[PDB]
């Protein structure tokens, strides 16, 4: 009833082989075009000016860091990180008690830091080791004396602190830096804070946070520091505000299972083709079927996206599963049927003899698959009402295509064979396009002297992630010297 159709189809293919090759290859390129390359202004780093304003994007809290340095004469006695560090903090505690109790005509009359300071006591479980190091009353200010719970008497009354501050340095080179370097700020290795005689530059890093900035406060504060600091520096700059971008790191283990899949997939291939290494012909023969089904799914992706109906999915994590489901027996069931045919001339007749006979079964298998997938789409679950469409398109494409490209490859192949090279070259090119869309599996793989991190760590400690948000820093200096 119908084998006449596929019969004439073999008459048509070998008659007009190469134009069909062109149609299919160029539609392949039309679909594999966008994927491997393809009301907010710029979420990424966009620094404008300190005298300016933000992008007005919340969740984005900006912290201000203060740098201060102490010097003793190139000649002195009893140079230990205890005494040379204490008097710095002798002044630090006074400064802390000034700022925390900063009385001044701010926007709210006699206002202090607390009125706008990030007030929150969200102490998370793992804070056990430091149940006495971070403020929990209602203030967000970090200093090394925080360890001493804002007690300078204990500080300048204790017997020793170097070991005590060491008390929480676990090991070396850990992505989670510390708490010590934090309330020091100055990295003892980059800042160069080491117990060196006649060459010592101890420094203390201070931190603060807020929601809205009001320089009416901070400029006037700095009026106090011009007298308090009184050091010899020209640093002043002007107005430049920096907005660090919060990048989120996908670990490695999070990545493993995906790759496992691809491994499995390659095995599905080598094993298919060992069925074909039997018959007298070259390896590239197998190649023809490999590139095709794949090129179809790839092709399918292109027509599945641009219509606008894959708003929640990628291919690198699904694409294999199709190559798993629909499979390749749907092209070798007929291949063996072809080579099994008599050795006659005008292959146009041999293929129209065998392919014509297997047409019935191929259509039955197709209708089976479509019954399956139509059942799925009939379900109201949305994520499956997505994947089913990837499927149906890949399937109809594999079918409406294979009879065109692979069929013609076989034609020219047995032509050159029983007789004795755009074919193999176009095949290699299709395989290059395939390996390219494969290397394009990344679609699912998706001041500054400070460390790479420890900025989000703070917020990580309070059921708050700053990866989406941005942070900004501005700086001031206050240094000292004596013998």
């Amino acid at each position: 009833k119908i084998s006449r159709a596929f019969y004439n189809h073999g008459l048509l293919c070998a008659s007009y082989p190469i134009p069909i090759i062109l149609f299919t290859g160029f539609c392949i390129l039309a679909c594999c075009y966008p994927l491997l390359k393809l009301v907010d202004s710029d979420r990424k780093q966009g620094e404008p000016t300190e005298q300016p304003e933000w992008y007005v994007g919340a969740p984005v809290a900006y912290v201000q860091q203060i740098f201060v340095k102490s010097s003793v004469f190139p000649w002195h006695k009893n140079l230990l990180a205890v005494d040379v560090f204490r008097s710095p903090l002798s002044r630090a505690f006074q400064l802390v008690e000034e700022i925390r109790n900063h009385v001044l005509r701010d926007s709210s009359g006699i206002r202090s830091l607390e009125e706008l300071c990030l007030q929150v006591t969200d102490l998370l479980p793992g804070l056990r080791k430091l149940r006495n190091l971070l403020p929990e009353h209602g203030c967000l200010l970090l200093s090394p004396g925080n360890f001493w719970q804002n007690d300078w008497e204990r500080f300048h009354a204790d017997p020793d602190i170097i070991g005590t501050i060491h008390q929480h340095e676990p090991k070396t080179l850990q992505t989670s830096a510390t708490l010590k370097d934090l309330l020091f700020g100055v990295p003892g290795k980059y800042s160069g804070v080491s117990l060196y005689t006649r060459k010592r530059m101890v420094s203390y890093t201070i931190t603060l946070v807020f929601q809205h900035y009001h320089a009416k406060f901070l400029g006037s504060l700095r009026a106090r520091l011009m007298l308090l600091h009184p050091s010899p520096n020209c640093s002043l700059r002007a107005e430049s505000l920096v907005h660090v971008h919060f990048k989120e790191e996908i670990g490695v283990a999070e990545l493993i299972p995906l790759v496992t899949t691809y491994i499995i997939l390659f095995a599905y291939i080598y094993f298919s083709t060992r069925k074909i290494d039997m018959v007298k012909s070259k390896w590239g023969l197998a190649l023809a079927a490999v590139v095709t089904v794949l090129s179809s799914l790839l092709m399918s992706v292109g027509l599945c996206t641009l219509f606008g109906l894959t708003p929640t999915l990628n291919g690198g994590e699904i694409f294999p599963y199709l190559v798993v489901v629909i499979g390749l027996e749907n092209v070798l069931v007929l291949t063996k049927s072809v080579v099994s045919t008599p050795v006659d001339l005008e292959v146009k007749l041999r293929i129209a003899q065998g392919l014509s006979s297997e047409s019935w079964s191929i259509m039955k298998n197709m209708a089976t698959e479509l019954g399956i997938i139509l059942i799925g789409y009939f379900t109201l679950v949305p994520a499956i009402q997505e994947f089913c469409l990837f499927a149906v398109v890949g399937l109809v494409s594999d079918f409406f295509l294979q009879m065109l490209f692979f069929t013609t490859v076989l034609s020219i192949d047995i032509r050159r064979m029983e007789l004795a090279r755009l074919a193999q070259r176009l095949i290699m090119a299709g395989t290059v396009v395939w390996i390219g869309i494969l290397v394009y599996t990344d679609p699912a793989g998706l001041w500054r002297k400070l460390s790479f991190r420890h900025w989000p760590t703070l917020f990580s400690y309070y059921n708050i992630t700053l990866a989406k948000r941005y942070i900004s820093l501005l700086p001031v200096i206050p240094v000292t010297l004596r013998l």
Binding site: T260, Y268, Y321
Partner: protein
């Protein structure tokens, strides 16, 4: 005696082989669900991979060996060995599906129980409709899945799992399908591996 000893070789050889396999799987598959453990002293890489302890993977693979040495010998002793699709490729298809489903184990959220029945019945049934039409392996995988379900559901009553919430239905609805699939996969593995010689 060297001949029957070479037989015993082949036998427990294949068992160790697929034991390593069951392990590889359980590792990868535990690692699939991505927990957000913010805690201080973040996890070292290998600890993120080699999770739990020596308790899990040896048992998982022991189960695999049990299965792979069970399904072929039963049909060796009862009837005739299997021949439906028995070439590695279909085995790999089954494995990939077993992986995909478990990857669908967490990243869905259902409307109603009827949707889960209507779909999982068909899914499990198909995974036997396609790679093994033996009624034996069917009635055996169903059984061992039943029993894995029960053992789990009563051990955590002492406590290994350590979860307790309205989600008590996940186990009563989802996992037995997993273990069903696993028995069948491992069976096709054992067949394709034993009928080498």
């Amino acid at each position: 005696i060297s001949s029957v000893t070479s037989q015993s070789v082949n036998l427990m050889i294949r068992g160790v082989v697929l034991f390593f396999i069951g392990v590889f799987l359980a590792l990868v598959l535990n690692l699939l669900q991505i927990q957000r453990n913010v805690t201080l002293f973040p996890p070292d890489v290998i600890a993120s991979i080699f999770s739990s302890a020596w308790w899990v993977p040896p048992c998982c693979g022991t189960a695999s060996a049990v299965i792979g040495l069970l399904y072929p010998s039963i049909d060796r002793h009862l009837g005739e060995p299997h021949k439906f699709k028995r070439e590695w490729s279909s085995v790999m298809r089954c494995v990939a599906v077993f992986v995909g489903i478990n990857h669908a184990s967490a990243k869905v959220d259902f409307d109603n129980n009827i949707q889960l029945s209507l779909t999982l019945a068909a899914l499990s049934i198909g995974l036997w409709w396609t790679f093994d039409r033996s009624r034996s392996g069917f009635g055996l995988g169903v059984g061992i899945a039943f029993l894995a379900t029960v053992v789990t559901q009563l051990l955590v009553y002492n406590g290994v799992y350590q979860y307790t919430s309205p989600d008590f239905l996940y186990v009563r609805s989802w996992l037995p399908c997993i273990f069903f699939a696993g028995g069948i996969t491992m069976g096709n593995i054992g067949r394709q591996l034993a009928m080498y010689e």
